[PDB]
Design a protein around this nucleic acid. Structure first.
Ligand code: DGT
Ligand code: CA
Ligand code: CA
Ligand code: CA
Length: 341
DNA sequence: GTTGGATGGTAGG
DNA sequence: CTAACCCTACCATCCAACC
């Protein structure tokens, strides 16, 4: 069982460099402008030239411009990166039909029936990389291991423009050596709970009574971690199926006024319904982000599919339901559809 | 004794 | 308006309905 994982390098920015070769070699920052004020919004991603100065996904644009005034700031174009992505995902399809698309820039190929061993996987990996570079002019990073988790880790070690195998040896070693916060799915809240406990390595999780582990991090992560340490984790590559689709936008200024908010919410339903694409949902949720950035939502599930007419009506009720139960003002508003037929 | 809906927490793209 | 966009997956909790 060999899994190969591909993750595109600084994707959004790379696509702009390809689309405009004069940018290449100098700082580039791809932004989501929010409309509230001059240069408001956040960074979606930056090239490595820019990361050298502290500019990464998530920081505010005005922060980016503080520390890197002279870089090139480009509005985000989602449609463009998604067509390049789809073209790339199709190239990958010619190397294994057994493909799991994980996000707009990464995919898992199960390559067992294509290669006899790690050495061949590596070669196939080099072949994938050239293919993509030839057809799309995009560099990527490749991770190869016996499962999804470790293929992901191997890639994280190799970025950017890399390729790395973690063979059955190294898997055994990393279950002992690797800091536990480097396990995909272990973020900041969970790492704290584990270090306060004295779990620093995947291996430590077999040295602790299951219920205390489960008591702290929850059942599912516990099973996840323990499964990973027994070297039994074997969750297969599966064709992903969107479970929800939605959209949320930022308002020019904070509001509580249903009339002032309404057109924002409706924009979101329109876009949302466009992306639905023949999918009928039974569940609608209105999501609202507040002044202090806390996220609040109100929903409903119908025994039956929701039409675009119903969505407009139910969402307005739900918005009011929010305004009713939370007295904070609203800063971003949107909607999320789920539970398809 | 377990669905599952409503809501929120966590993680990561 | 004075920083914090953006989209999705999975899980936990509290709560009800079933039976
Ligand atoms: N709007 C927004 N978009 C993001 C954010 N994080 C990632 N993206 C988008 C932009 C990235 O180019 C793309 C892929 O994200 P990645 O996590 O793989 O990092 P990226 O490819 O940009 O650099 P790479 O070498 O992986 O590290 O997804 C974010 O916080 N906000
Ligand atoms: Ca990437
Ligand atoms: Ca990625
Ligand atoms: Ca981590």
């Amino acid at each position: 069982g060999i899994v190969l994982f591909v993750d595109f390098d600084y994707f959004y920015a790379q696509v702009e460099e390809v689309l405009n070769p004069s940018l290449k070699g100098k700082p580039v920052v791809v932004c989501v402008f929010s409309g509230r004020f001059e240069d408001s919004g956040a960074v979606a991603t930056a090239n490595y030239e820019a990361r050298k100065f502290g500019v990464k996904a998530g920081i505010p644009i005005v922060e980016a411009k503080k520390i890197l005034p002279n870089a090139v700031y480009l509005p985000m174009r989602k449609e463009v990166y998604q067509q390049v992505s789809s073209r790339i995902m199709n190239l990958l399809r010619e190397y294994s039909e057994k493909i799991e698309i994980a996000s707009i820039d990464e995919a898992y190929l199960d390559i067992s029936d294509k290669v006899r061993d790690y050495r061949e996987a590596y070669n196939l990996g080099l072949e994938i990389k050239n293919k993509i570079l030839e057809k799309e002019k995009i560099t990527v990073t490749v991770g190869i291991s016996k499962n999804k988790v470790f293929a992901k880790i191997a890639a994280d070690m190799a970025k950017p423009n890399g390729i790395k195998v973690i063979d059955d040896e190294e898997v055994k070693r990393l279950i002992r050596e690797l800091d536990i916060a480097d396990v995909p799915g272990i973020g900041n809240i969970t790492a704290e709970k584990l270090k306060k406990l004295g779990i620093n390595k995947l291996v430590d999780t077999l040295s602790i009574e299951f219920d205390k582990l489960k008591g702290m991090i929850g059942e599912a992560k516990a099973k996840y971690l323990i499964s990973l340490a027994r070297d039994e984790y074997n969750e297969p590559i599966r064709t992903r199926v969107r479970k929800s689709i939605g959209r949320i936008v930022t308002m020019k200024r904070n509001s509580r006024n249903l009339e002032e908010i309404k057109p924002y919410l409706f924009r979101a339903i329109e876009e949302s319904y466009y992306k639905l694409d023949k999918r009928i949902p039974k569940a609608i949720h209105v999501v609202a982000v507040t002044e202090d950035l806390d996220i609040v939502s109100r929903g409903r599930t119908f025994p039956h599919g929701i039409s675009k007419e119903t969505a407009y009506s139910e969402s307005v009720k739900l918005l009011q339901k929010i305004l009713e139960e939370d007295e904070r003002k609203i800063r971003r508003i949107g909607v999320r559809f789920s539970k398809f037929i």
